[PDB]
Design an enzyme around this catalytic site. Structure first.
Site: not given
Ligand code: A1BMS
Ligand code: A1BMS
Lengths: 269, 268
Positions: B190, B192, B227
């Site tokens: 995804n 991330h 992050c």
């Protein structure tokens, strides 16, 4: 995994993991390259090579020699999905005094169709001096025991991509990713940067829009010099092209010393 | 991988790969963390969670909700060698309206001995607003179907390390590694940053001398903020001592905290 019936090749099956896949829920080319290197290690162990991380023969240990990659070439027709089983067959061939070749075929476990193929060139290096050399008679004899003596090529075609000369990218590059450094997860058990790391670094300078709208079909990577644990890398890319083609350079961030060059071919989804 | 007899836990076996091991030819704590995440996804899939990489329940999809990690705690007694088989058992538990826990036990397949354990805390987040919230009655009911209803803890000991409050490291740090950036291999499906990446960044600021002469016994990592793909991270470490360290990850620019943690290391 196991040696095949004739003891001249090795097969292993892998289930594609959650963390091994990209945006399409299919395996990354980096996951593919790690699996190629895993099955290659399992084959080397099965035919009696060293278990000390260097995968040497008896003669190579005596003379303080190791194999280093000169080139990796991967062509993927279908990336296996998350939870899919991929079967990889691998074998080695001697190429006179030049070096050795390791080849791979990737199959869908369920259908038995070929979904990819790969080839790599290896040259002999003195471990202490880091100087390249030719293959000795004694090493060529060791390779006769576990390699097919008739030619067996993943890329048989007499004028095929896996053997094309790659030019050096000229400044200015069209795209760049600067200040790439390896972390401990990028190192092998002997504290050298993993050969797969250099694939990731090359791809970092491909615009996100290409990756989002294209599938990688072919990557050819030449290995010129290793990145040390404390080196910093710049990744450079220029479009050379419905198919997209790119020229790639990795070079040290400071003095611009070449570590790799390559090409990628991408087709729109 | 299979659900166990009672359907309330899940077990999988993993052969440790060549590229998974560090310099003593045993699995890295990062390899262990990836294997914990993988058996976790395999369990979620076996008990009818989404297959879209967000691993949501039916009412979570309706309400645009996701689980995010608050804390990961891992204790390793023996790291499995290259080509050893490690067996991992995992299960979940509801903690009222606070959140959920996933726990793991790692075993040597050959001896059946426990070689490690881990626990993780998860909090509900609106996917759109990124706002933390409590667990709904409807989500707590979905968890009753596949979790033991009596407490089952990888860390039973009342007042154990896995529940210790972690202080914020004070400048100046004893050690630092700066300008850390994620590459595409660091992202999940995804886009991330993989939770395991943050573990590697924490360990980057430990001196090579420590890693060479000690084994990591315990790591406790709090997750404060993600992050992003285009963010840059500084990893800071200070000795508090066995060797013990305090850790901080912050954004290279404005110094926004992304994680804090502690590690405990035993001389080899
Ligand atoms: C006879 O086998 C030697 C061998 O394969 N060893 C490797 C290091 C080179 C090819 S690899 O990357 O697959 C693993
Ligand atoms: C019902 O279980 C959900 C689940 O486990 N999902 C994860 C995303 C969080 C814990 S994980 O990292 O193991 C995988």
């Amino acid at each position: 995994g196991s040696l095949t019936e004739d003891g001249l090749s090795y097969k292993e099956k892998f289930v594609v993991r959650s963390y091994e896949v990209g945006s399409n829920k299919t395996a990354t080319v980096e996951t593919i390259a790690n699996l190629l290197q895993e099955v290659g290690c399992n084959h080397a162990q099965s035919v009696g090579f060293s278990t000390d991380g260097f995968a040497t023969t008896t003669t190579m240990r005596k003379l303080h020699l190791i194999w280093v990659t000169a080139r990796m070439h991967i062509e993927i027709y279908k990336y296996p999905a998350w939870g899919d089983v991929v079967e990889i067959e691998t074998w080695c061939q001697s190429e006179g005094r030049i070096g050795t070749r390791r080849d791979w075929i990737l199959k869908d476990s369920v259908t038995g169709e070929v979904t990819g193929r790969a080839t790599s060139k290896w040259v002999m290096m003195n471990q202490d001096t880091r100087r390249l050399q030719k293959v000795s008679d004694d090493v060529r004899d060791e390779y006769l025991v576990f390699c097919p003596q008739e030619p067996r090529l993943a890329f048989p075609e007499e004028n095929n991509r896996s053997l094309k000369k790659i030019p050096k990218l000229e400044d200015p590059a069209q795209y760049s990713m600067i200040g790439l450094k390896p972390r401990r997860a990028d190192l092998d058990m002997n504290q050298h940067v993993n050969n797969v790391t250099y694939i990731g670094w090359v791809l970092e300078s491909i615009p996100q829009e290409i990756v989002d709208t294209h599938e990688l079909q072919v990557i050819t990577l030449d290995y010129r010099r290793e990145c040390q644990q404390d080196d910093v890398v710049d990744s450079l890319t220029t479009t050379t092209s419905n198919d997209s083609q790119f020229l790639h350079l990795l070079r040290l961030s400071g003095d611009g010393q070449e570590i790799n060059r390559g090409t990628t071919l991408w087709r729109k989804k």
